[PDB]
Amino acid sequence: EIDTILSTLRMEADPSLHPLFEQFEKFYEEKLWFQLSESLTKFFDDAKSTPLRLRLYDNFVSKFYDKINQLSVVKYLLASLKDSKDFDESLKYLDDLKAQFQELDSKKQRNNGSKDHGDGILLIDSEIARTYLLKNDLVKARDLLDDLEKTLDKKDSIPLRITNSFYSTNSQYFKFKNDFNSFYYTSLLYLSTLEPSTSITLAERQQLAYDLSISALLGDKIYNFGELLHHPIMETIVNDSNYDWLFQLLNALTVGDFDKFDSLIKVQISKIPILAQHESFLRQKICLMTLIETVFVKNIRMLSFEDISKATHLPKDNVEHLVMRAISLGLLKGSIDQVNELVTISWVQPRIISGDQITKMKDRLVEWNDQVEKLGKKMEARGQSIWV
Amino acid sequence: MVLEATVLVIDNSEYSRNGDFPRTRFEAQIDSVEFIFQAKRNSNPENTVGLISGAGANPRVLSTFTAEFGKILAGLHDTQIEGKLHMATALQIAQLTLKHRQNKVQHQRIVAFVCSPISDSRDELIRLAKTLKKNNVAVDIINFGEIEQNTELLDEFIAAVNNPQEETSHLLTVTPGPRLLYENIASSPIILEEGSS
């Protein structure tokens, strides 16, 4: 039964991979099924690339169609169909399974005690959208996102596994459209809810990191550059060669120098054509950052066009445009004169709070406490005979 | 038997679904929880049983002490099939439940099905040992899960709890073969048992 199937897997495979097929069979005899589930996991962790991976699934799913937990089972298929080079085949298998899960739930309910079963279904619809996108159908995936999003919100919560796959599809779609802004939001969440599995290869995580850095260079209101380098995702890959000059564009932006930025960008614009098509956004971005920064670290509320023009290396003609985009983006608030040529700031954007700034907050509160306590002492002496 | 208050503890670990008992161990348990409730009542009808889970990843009080199986049934069907048994929490929770009752002249018992090996701290086990001896609570554990690859940490403590006393605490070990789970509990003493007095 399982015996005939087991022989057939071993033969077409390599000698190195015979004991893997053997571990499963052993758990089956003893009937320890906690161990059988774990041992499938070791398989799909690092041998989802073997040609037999899909068939191996086909015997186990039939047995544990309604016996063990639905999240467990489904998980194997998804990993198997991430390793197929033929996506027409991938779409067919999902479409059958999708169909089985709609029948299954009738049966399955009585076995568990009472449980959900929409868990497998949500993951299947994501895989249909991802197959479409690797084949370049933006629209078919597009109506699948809408319908899939609403079902997340219908529940009080979605699991971390389920929501990674939903956010998996969103990342793929956005980088084709070439919206940096959209790509950025999906990646920061993906790291938060990121699966604890080693089943998600590090190769994907690296690739995802490169694209993330690119979103924030071309971005439109992202002043989270320091923040990006704190999280493990970028911190550890600083000493890799192709992600050197890439992080140096982060660091040049921070300190607000124009020369380190100039020397870098002239090389990488030529080398990589991604920086070429979004050139218009890239130059402006520095200018905006310089402006905000000079405003934030100081405590005064106005600057002449003369101070601004030296800082940003722009003439006073372009400076008035620079100011208009900053107010519009939501970085600053204020008003503009051209008759005294001031920018009057009235609002600054709360940014990363450093240890030093906490001390600073505190000093002022002590100043205000004393003032209140003093006034309240006088206000007792006054009105002493007239109170309730 | 005598008028007895029992907390039945159900394990909802991910070894509670092993194929050892037909059809699945989880379906085997539905039949045993029902079976056991009934055995106790038919012995002497002044028995009551409450329901708590020791697993689901969280322990949960479903049911306090009741003479209706309809509530105990209702608590059982609401379960989440994955967990891990937290041995320590079940004993404590069970003990507090036993302090408050509708009759406070009843024997104090905890019966727990254990479907997995324990992952609990050693120190933690030693503290509960003397907590059961302070409050004069006796416990029969039905084990068919902690003998599959584990050795009984629990043995010494369960022994210690026994005193001359109309209740006898016992470790009950079940061969985990096919003959169904309610049947092995029935053929184990649990209402065929004698006292220590």
Side-chain angles (χ1 to χ4, degrees):
Chain A
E1 187 282 291
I2 185 159
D3 299 283
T4 32
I5 314 171
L6 193 72
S7 300
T8 57
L9 286 167
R10 296 183 298 194
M11 294 149 59
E12 310 270 295
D14 309 308
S16 313
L17 298 160
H18 294 3
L20 320 169
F21 302 120
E22 299 188 76
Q23 300 179 304
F24 299 123
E25 185 58 85
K26 288 190 195 287
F27 292 121
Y28 205 56
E29 302 178 284
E30 297 186 316
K31 316 195 86 184
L32 304 182
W33 290 356
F34 192 53
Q35 305 282 340
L36 196 146
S37 199
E38 301 186 64
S39 62
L40 293 156
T41 309
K42 281 179 206 74
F43 203 93
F44 291 102
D45 203 313
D46 67 302
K48 45 176 196 158
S49 297
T50 55
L52 283 320
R53 80 297 170 176
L54 199 62
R55 300 198 292 127
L56 173 72
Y57 178 60
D58 306 315
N59 62 99
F60 299 112
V61 64
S62 314
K63 293 181 165 180
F64 312 132
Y65 69 115
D66 45 18
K67 294 178 171 83
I68 79 189
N69 194 264
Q70 205 184 46
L71 187 58
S72 305
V73 191
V74 62
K75 186 161 174 296
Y76 320 122
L77 187 51
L78 308 162
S80 306
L81 290 176
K82 270 160 177 64
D83 275 295
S84 192
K85 299 293 173 297
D86 305 293
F87 302 96
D88 298 292
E89 178 178 45
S90 308
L91 190 68
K92 187 40 58 183
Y93 249 86
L94 302 157
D95 298 343
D96 295 322
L97 212 71
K98 174 162 172 56
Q100 185 183 100
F101 288 11
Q102 293 168 205
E103 297 290 302
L104 178 67
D105 33 67
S106 309
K107 320 181 186 182
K108 185 158 173 65
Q109 190 161 266
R110 311 183 305 198
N111 296 133
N112 296 332
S114 189
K115 218 190 70 68
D116 197 89
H117 308 277
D119 309 301
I121 332 192
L122 308 165
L123 291 155
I124 288 161
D125 286 63
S126 310
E127 197 59 66
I128 293 171
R130 291 187 286 255
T131 67
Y132 282 141
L133 285 170
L134 265 158
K135 295 196 291 287
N136 307 340
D137 301 73
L138 306 167
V139 203
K140 295 179 181 173
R142 195 186 305 236
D143 61 290
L144 282 168
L145 295 183
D146 297 301
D147 271 49
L148 200 40
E149 182 173 314
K150 283 170 191 48
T151 314
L152 311 185
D153 284 299
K154 178 161 62 205
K155 294 182 191 306
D156 311 68
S157 184
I158 187 81
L160 315 194
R161 279 91 259 177
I162 309 169
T163 206
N164 175 254
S165 308
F166 173 57
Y167 288 159
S168 293
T169 304
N170 294 306
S171 296
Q172 186 164 64
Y173 175 68
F174 298 132
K175 61 161 207 303
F176 298 161
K177 280 292 257 57
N178 307 123
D179 296 72
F180 24 87
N181 45 60
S182 289
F183 191 93
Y184 180 87
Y185 293 114
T186 319
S187 301
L188 261 61
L189 288 177
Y190 191 103
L191 184 76
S192 313
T193 205
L194 172 74
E195 312 180 16
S197 303
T198 320
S199 309
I200 308 306
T201 46
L202 294 180
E204 307 171 73
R205 302 191 187 177
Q206 295 175 276
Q207 190 49 247
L208 177 50
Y210 173 77
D211 295 291
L212 181 50
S213 178
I214 311 289
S215 307
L217 305 168
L218 297 176
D220 74 280
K221 58 183 61 162
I222 294 164
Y223 287 104
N224 297 98
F225 306 129
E227 186 167 63
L228 284 169
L229 279 162
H230 290 153
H231 301 172
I233 192 176
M234 300 304 188
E235 198 187 75
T236 67
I237 49 158
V238 305
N239 291 161
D240 293 287
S241 62
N242 291 40
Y243 313 127
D244 179 274
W245 44 268
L246 182 84
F247 289 171
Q248 288 180 292
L249 294 153
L250 301 181
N251 310 317
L253 257 150
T254 305
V255 302
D257 203 64
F258 281 77
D259 317 292
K260 171 164 170 167
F261 166 76
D262 285 335
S263 69
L264 290 161
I265 179 176
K266 303 304 188 295
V267 195
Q268 297 300 152
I269 205 148
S270 300
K271 197 173 162 295
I272 309 287
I274 315 177
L275 273 58
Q277 58 194 287
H278 306 106
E279 185 275 309
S280 298
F281 293 122
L282 204 48
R283 300 302 293 220
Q284 196 197 78
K285 189 60 178 183
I286 318 302
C287 300
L288 279 158
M289 181 43 186
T290 294
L291 192 53
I292 52 170
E293 190 56 89
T294 42
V295 161
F296 192 91
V297 294
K298 311 200 284 170
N299 288 110
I300 47 170
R301 295 273 67 163
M302 72 294 110
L303 296 164
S304 46
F305 289 0
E306 294 60 77
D307 300 296
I308 299 179
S309 294
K310 69 181 156 54
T312 58
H313 290 286
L314 279 173
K316 297 165 196 201
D317 294 310
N318 279 224
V319 157
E320 313 200 30
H321 306 85
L322 188 56
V323 170
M324 207 279 315
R325 291 297 296 107
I327 314 165
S328 196
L329 281 166
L331 327 173
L332 295 155
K333 310 284 167 73
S335 54
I336 314 168
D337 303 314
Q338 208 304 260
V339 190
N340 299 62
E341 296 186 285
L342 290 178
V343 62
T344 309
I345 307 302
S346 47
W347 186 62
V348 280
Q349 179 170 314
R351 298 177 84 189
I352 308 189
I353 308 304
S354 283
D356 180 280
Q357 297 186 0
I358 304 186
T359 304
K360 298 286 175 262
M361 279 190 192
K362 185 196 158 182
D363 288 299
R364 302 180 186 87
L365 294 193
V366 187
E367 301 180 74
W368 296 0
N369 181 228
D370 298 296
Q371 289 178 250
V372 175
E373 156 256 319
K374 183 189 299 191
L375 178 63
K377 170 53 188 188
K378 297 170 176 177
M379 292 181 68
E380 299 176 61
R382 288 183 207 125
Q384 191 54 249
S385 62
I386 275 299
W387 303 117
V388 172
Chain B
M1 293 194 72
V2 271
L3 72 164
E4 181 178 61
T6 319
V7 193
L8 188 48
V9 191
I10 58 185
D11 187 29
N12 298 302
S13 60
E14 310 187 63
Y15 290 89
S16 295
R17 56 189 197 181
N18 293 348
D20 313 82
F21 300 130
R23 180 191 80 164
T24 309
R25 172 171 291 197
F26 210 75
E27 304 168 61
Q29 270 186 296
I30 302 154
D31 301 315
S32 308
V33 171
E34 294 170 5
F35 168 83
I36 289 291
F37 184 94
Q38 296 153 164
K40 288 185 176 308
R41 190 161 56 159
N42 294 173
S43 307
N44 181 88
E46 305 194 266
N47 285 27
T48 49
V49 196
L51 205 61
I52 62 169
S53 295
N58 286 95
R60 50 194 159 272
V61 186
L62 291 156
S63 306
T64 47
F65 290 110
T66 195
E68 277 287 347
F69 70 91
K71 191 74 192 182
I72 298 298
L73 180 59
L76 179 51
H77 312 312
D78 193 61
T79 201
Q80 172 71 84
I81 47 171
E82 283 202 356
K84 173 77 172 79
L85 184 79
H86 290 71
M87 193 54 222
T89 63
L91 289 173
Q92 289 176 63
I93 290 162
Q95 281 176 107
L96 296 184
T97 297
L98 292 156
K99 292 284 160 278
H100 297 89
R101 297 193 287 222
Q102 63 294 303
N103 287 128
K104 308 188 199 178
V105 289
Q106 281 164 324
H107 284 182
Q108 294 175 67
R109 190 73 67 146
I110 310 165
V111 177
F113 309 135
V114 159
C115 298
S116 48
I118 63 171
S119 294
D120 298 62
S121 278
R122 176 75 196 174
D123 300 290
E124 182 44 39
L125 299 170
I126 295 171
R127 190 263 169 167
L128 295 170
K130 318 295 167 320
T131 319
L132 298 151
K133 296 154 74 60
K134 275 165 63 188
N135 286 316
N136 184 253
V137 193
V139 44
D140 287 356
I141 300 293
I142 278 278
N143 287 97
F144 44 98
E146 189 185 319
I147 44 171
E148 309 195 276
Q149 51 195 246
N150 206 8
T151 57
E152 293 302 295
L153 284 72
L154 302 185
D155 196 53
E156 182 183 318
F157 307 122
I158 298 171
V161 170
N162 188 12
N163 277 307
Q165 192 178 333
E166 188 170 3
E167 310 193 69
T168 296
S169 56
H170 285 102
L171 172 98
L172 295 158
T173 50
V174 180
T175 308
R179 218 182 68 180
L180 282 147
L181 183 44
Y182 52 85
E183 190 63 38
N184 287 319
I185 314 169
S187 305
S188 284
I190 195 153
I191 50 174
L192 299 192
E193 75 174 75
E194 299 310 288
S196 163
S197 39

